[PDB]
């Protein structure tokens, strides 16, 4: 399209950028640990819980990638886990309402990052790769086209990304490197590169710095279409009291929504936050949208 109104959409926001426009140009807002909405056990929220929201709140929201962590069981199904503990969500229920979604608003498209989080129930009868390919990848929501993928492509489907090693079908992004705990840089496709800033357990000071200065780089190489830059704004931590990743959220979102709004960037990568919602007065999600208003 045409007109910068268009961002102001959450439902539709990618609906006025250009088709020709690679995933990795643009600023998409996400979820880390998207599943964790439905933790309603207080010991459990303070540790686990990173959204309060479902995933049609999210993506009425604006989020476009989604942080999905699974777990193969007994009954050869997928379901959403964090850590040892089972979110009450299975894959099933991601993929529908990404669907729903998706057709209410086909302009649209979504990024689903998939983790193996914890290890396999003892009665599995396929590996983790073998069964998310052959009982949901074969889907055709989900996009089967590698490479710099544009936007014209992904509208109405689902692009995959993959943190789960073993995979058979082509389709999406594939599996890279990934260090625990910190911030790098590897390659993805031959056509690719990736920046990300993944410091959990952190210190408070440490991980503001660590997003300024990743996103500080991004909006630098803004005109590298061949560089994706995932920016996880989240640290969680022996939360139990205030030192959950509320509290953290609470302050990493308003801070660097801000800096954004300052900043007047032209690119900001792909932030991943926890905790969204309208609560935060600044709203991060809605400033990582507005940057995209250099593509239109
Ligand atoms: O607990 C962490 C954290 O959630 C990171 O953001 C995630 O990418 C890591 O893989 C995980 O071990």
């Given at each position: 399209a045409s007109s910068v109104n268009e961002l102001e959409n959450w439902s539709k926001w990618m609906q006025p950028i250009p088709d020709s426009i690679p995933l990795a140009r643009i600023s998409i807002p996400g979820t880390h640990?998207?599943?964790?909405?439905?933790?309603?056990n207080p010991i459990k929220q303070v540790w686990?819980?990173?959204?309060?929201?479902?995933f049609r709140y999210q993506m009425d929201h604006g989020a476009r990638i989604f942080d999905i962590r699974g777990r193969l069981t007994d009954d050869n199904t997928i379901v959403l886990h964090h850590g040892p503990l089972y979110?009450?969500?299975t894959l099933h229920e991601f993929i529908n309402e990404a669907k729903q979604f998706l057709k209410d608003n086909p302009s649209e498209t979504i990024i689903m990052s998939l983790k193996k989080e914890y290890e396999d129930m003892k009665?599995?009868?396929?590996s983790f790769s073998s069964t998310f390919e052959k009982?949901?990848?074969?889907?055709?929501?989900?996009?089967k086209t590698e490479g710099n993928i544009k936007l014209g492509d992904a509208r109405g489907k689902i692009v995959l990304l993959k943190?789960?090693?073993?995979?058979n079908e082509p389709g999406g992004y594939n599996n890279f490197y990934?260090?625990?705990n910190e911030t790098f840089t590897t390659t993805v496709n031959q056509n690719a590169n990736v920046t990300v800033?993944?410091?959990?357990?952190?210190?408070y000071d440490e991980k503001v710095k660590s997003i300024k200065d990743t996103m500080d780089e991004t909006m630098n190489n803004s005109?590298?279409?061949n560089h994706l830059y995932i920016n996880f704004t989240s640290l969680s931590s022996?939360?139990?009291?205030?030192?959950?990743p509320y509290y953290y959220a609470s302050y990493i979102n308003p801070e660097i929504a801000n800096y954004i709004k300052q900043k007047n960037p032209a690119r900001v990568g792909w932030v991943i936050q926890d905790y969204?919602?309208?609560?935060?007065?600044?709203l991060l999600y809605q400033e990582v949208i507005r940057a995209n208003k250099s593509l239109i």
């Open positions: 640990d998207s599943g964790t909405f439905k933790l309603q686990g819980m990173t959204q309060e929201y479902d979110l009450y969500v009665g599995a009868e396929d009982k949901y990848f074969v889907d055709p929501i989900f996009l943190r789960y090693s073993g995979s990934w260090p625990d800033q993944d410091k959990y357990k952190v210190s005109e590298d279409l022996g939360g139990t009291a205030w030192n959950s969204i919602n309208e609560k935060w007065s600044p």
